[PDB]
Paper text:
We have recently identified a blue CuNiR from Bradyrhizobium ORS 375 of the order Rhizobiales (Br2DNiR). CuNiRs, encoded by the nirK gene, are key enzymes in the denitrification pathway, as it is at this point that the bioavailable fixed nitrogen gets recycled back to the atmosphere. These redox-active metalloenzymes are responsible for catalyzing the one-electron and two-proton reduction of NO2− to gaseous product NO in the first committed step of this pathway (NO2− + 2H+ + e−→NO + H2O). CuNiRs are a highly conserved enzyme family that use cupredoxin-like domains to assemble a catalytic core made up of type 1 Cu (T1Cu) and type 2 Cu (T2Cu). Two invariant active-site pocket residues AspCAT and HisCAT are involved in substrate binding and provision of protons during catalysis, and a conserved IleCAT residue provides steric control of ligand binding to the T2Cu.
To characterize this new two-domain CuNiR enzyme, we obtained a 1.1 Å atomic-resolution structure in its as-isolated state using conventional synchrotron-radiation crystallography (SRX) at 100 K. To provide rigor and reduce the ambiguities in the assignments of multiple conformations of active-site ligands and define SDs of individual bond distances and angles of residues in the catalytic core, we used SHELX-97 [estimated standard deviation (e.s.d.) values available from SHELX are given in brackets]. Two waters, W1 and W2, with equal occupancies (0.67) are 2.49 Å apart and bound to the T2Cu atom at distances of 1.940(3) Å and 2.162(3) Å, respectively. The occupancies of ~0.7 for these two waters strongly argue for their coexistence rather than alternate conformations of the same water. An alternative third water, W3, bound at 2.018(3) Å with ideal tetrahedral geometry to T2Cu with an occupancy of 0.33 represents the site in molecules where both W1 and W2 are absent. In its main conformation, the carboxyl oxygen (Oδ2) atom of AspCAT is hydrogen bonded with water W1 and a substrate channel water (W4) with 0.5 occupancy at distances 2.52 and 2.45 Å, respectively, while Oδ2 atom of the distorted conformation is bound to W3 (3.13 Å). The catalytically important HisCAT residue (His250) has its imidazole ring rotated toward Glu274 forming a strong hydrogen bond by its Nδ1 atom with the main-chain carbonyl oxygen of Glu274 at 2.67 Å.
Numbering used by the authors:
A (entry chain A), B (entry chain A), C (entry chain A): 3 to 347
Write the structure that this text describes.
């Protein structure tokens, strides 16, 4: 009855993004996606703490879906019988039935097919939402991702000029609530159900034990730093389904930032730090101007350095001494310096 | 000496709003309001927990006042002698004397009359502010509401086009700080004064025990869901006098959102989730496109589902299968499905 | 090799700001600043609680630096041998090398000279960032300030009209994490290193013990209230390097607010309360219209009244009864008043 071409999309694990066109002259299609729920224990920090997670497609965050305005998105949500709980999906991009949640509740061993029209442009959260207290628990257990609905003409600067990215990354930030024992050590559990009561108690106090990108402290540092090159315009999509965040690229800026994430609004320019409201996705474009390591953080630095929420970019290219230079390397304070006369002493 | 017509306004309890014109061709008037402080015990959650509250006009939030730009607002604040504490009022809409607080301190048995000129358009918080530590305590005990100052031409989209709402609701969100005993159960008290010391200790840790709309968990669910119809443009005013919130309409959007709440600024379009800075009111317009239940939450889902901060809309009308449809109802996973080959396993 | 004039700037302690031009017809210069790290015990509240602080130039916040777009900023960072730890500096205004942090690590007894080009307009945080867990600890110990990069034509309203301030103040807000003993009293320490382990435990819970302006509760009240006069347009720069804030001027407004702090974006008008994302600076202009005391707060009123985050302005001039007036002073409730008939009773 909807007589449009169908196109199957193969998702990829974050922070990477499946192939897509930015601008397109194709007309609306039915874009077909499959999301498979996977409940499993996962490692969430550098000390090896484990966690009873619930995911779409085995990752935290779930994968980024990319479509264009006016496409229809036909999602097969699958809940294999190796899982123990019912699940569903709420697309913040969609209109009606609790985002789809009221049409996608499935028991282990079931699947369901939801179609929603992509009438709203931007980046948007999707997440599980079974009902009642299960809603926050499934979300903070990992069941959230994002979808991007691009304008058919691609992005623009809000002032009539096209913007094109050379690279895209999806940073899903996750607040986790991990019980501790009387000795103060994180507790391990053999199933999500066994974890629940203790976890709910931590959730109620609204203070995460971990705040991570791509599912664990250190996930996007080390060998898994994000690559870029001087001159590239990089789109960084950031989502947080449950709790606020304040992204910042250390040594960079947000050249164009949609912090509320919706491309019908002009981006802000030249930001230092932006703000992702819990329950949303936002996006920032930055053209790299200097090589080296950059850290990408939430700028509650306690969260960034001590709870897990730091990623790295490794950027190749040539240093620009006009923008920044070390005029004099560290040296002993001159003996004839006069700092004892300064106003603050 | 101010020679303008006087118009008495009868307030109504939230989430409803007293009758008013959106656009008007009337000139400035003196709009007369009465607010009566009421200290009383109130029920704040579904388990029947009680709370020593302080209110304007017996409700949390206090009622929404609606005027137009250039009106004068003449408020009689009354503190009956059945109350035990002094009170005052701070209008964030007003200019001077600590919002009016420095001109309205009244003891039990007194009343005072304040007039302020509505020179600033938008939605704004009002709240009690007696002085010092009493300021946060009176506010988080319930003494806060909002006022809307409409442009005389009504709302517009920031791009020269009038916007008109068919319905308006006021959602006041309240962070509450309820002591617990050694057994972990919420404590009851016989007066606000007896509650204070234990309550201040909870306040100091900055984590509410409850986050509620219209004064209690479940207030706007059940029989008291908010009504609307497909096609109606609904204005949802949201205030929070002490603490941030991130509103979201599950299954909907914010078509036009003034998240900082001030109508001299163009609204943002097509938001998923917005942000109410503690100490402010904001507003969102949404035209309903689908019937059914919608949940309206703060999108810290722990707060929403576990601390009280969920409302419902019940929307009548006809479902639009073009926007969203269940293509296939829940069914067993096909035996010949191949999910073991998916990239994430 | 950079052949520009050099101009040495003498910094002053906050909340005051060194002398500068708003609009200028001078061309780019090399603007020379010196920042000296000082580790010392400081008093942070009205009860005399002490704290092992780390500062730039002896103050919390560090001083406001002011330059113009296209200037080069050449900073000599000095770490005297009376200090115990290494330090560095990250300018959110700068491009490359972790904001400068990767080029400025200095041991006690060393200094370094960094030059960065002021290519981005706005107010921006600067802060120490040595590496790893030392990053949040140095910041929340006090090592953060701000820099303002003005357009050469000065500020404008985003709609082609120049804005000029008569006065400028810099409000640096600081979240502090002070351990308590088993009796609940704040603990004192003899060095930052001795404080660290207990302090990190408080930091991990993400709830400050104190939230202060200009380094201590009460710093900008009393004798040190901020002065202004009716009619003056005052720029209030607000920074927070680690944690969100929601500024509000009680009895006033933000006439023009850059809450993300970047002057390539038009300001919002007529705000009640704005939002400083942790890790940023923002700015608000307000033209005073009434004399008297104003309080300037973060509008988590618990933070404002109970954790230290209130400043005052003392404004001289003549009261305007058109904007606000006490129509009737406090009086007994009339005997023939009818309040028992009101809808809420
Ligand atoms: Cu689920
Ligand atoms: Cu949601
Ligand atoms: Cu009161
Ligand atoms: Cu206020
Ligand atoms: Cu340092
Ligand atoms: Cu930083």
């Amino acid at each position: 009855d909807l007589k449009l071409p169908r196109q199957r999309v193969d998702l990829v694990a974050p922070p990477f993004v499946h192939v897509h066109e930015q601008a397109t002259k194709q007309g609306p299609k039915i874009m077909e996606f499959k999301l498979v729920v996977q409940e499993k224990k996962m490692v969430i920090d550098e000390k090896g703490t484990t966690f009873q997670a619930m995911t779409f497609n085995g990752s935290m965050p779930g994968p980024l879906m990319v479509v264009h305005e006016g496409d229809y998105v036909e999602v097969t949500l699958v809940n294999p019988a190796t899982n123990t709980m019912p699940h569903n999906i709420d697309f913040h991009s969609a209109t009606g039935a609790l985002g789809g949640g009221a049409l996608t509740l499935i028991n282990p061993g079931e699947q369901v097919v939801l179609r929603w029209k992509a009438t709203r442009t931007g980046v948007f959260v999707y997440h599980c939402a079974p009902g009642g207290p299960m809603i926050p628990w499934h979300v903070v257990s990992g069941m959230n991702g994002a979808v991007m609905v691009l304008p058919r003409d691609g992005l623009n600067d809000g002032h009539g000029h096209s913007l094109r990215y050379d690279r895209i990354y999806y940073i899903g930030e996750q607040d986790l609530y991990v019980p501790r024992d009387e000795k103060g050590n994180f507790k391990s559990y053999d199933s999500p159900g066994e974890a629940y009561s203790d976890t709910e108690e931590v959730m109620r106090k609204l203070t995460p034990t971990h705040v991570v990108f791509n599912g664990k402290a250190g996930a996007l540092t080390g060998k898994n730093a994000l690559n870029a090159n001087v001159g590239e315009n990089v789109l960084i999509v950031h989502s947080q389904a449950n709790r606020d965040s304040r992204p910042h690229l250390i040594g960079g800026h947000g050249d164009y930032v949609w912090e509320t994430g919706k491309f019908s609004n002009a981006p802000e320019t030249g930001l230092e730090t932006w703000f992702i409201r819990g329950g949303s996705a936002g996006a920032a474009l930055y053209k790299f101007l200097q090589p080296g390591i950059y850290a990408y953080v939430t700028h509650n630095l306690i969260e960034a350095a001590n709870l897990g929420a730091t990623a790295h970019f490794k950027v190749e290219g040539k240093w620009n001494d006009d923008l920044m230079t070390q005029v004099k390397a560290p040296a002993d304070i001159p003996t004839g310096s006069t700092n004892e006369n300064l106003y603050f002493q």
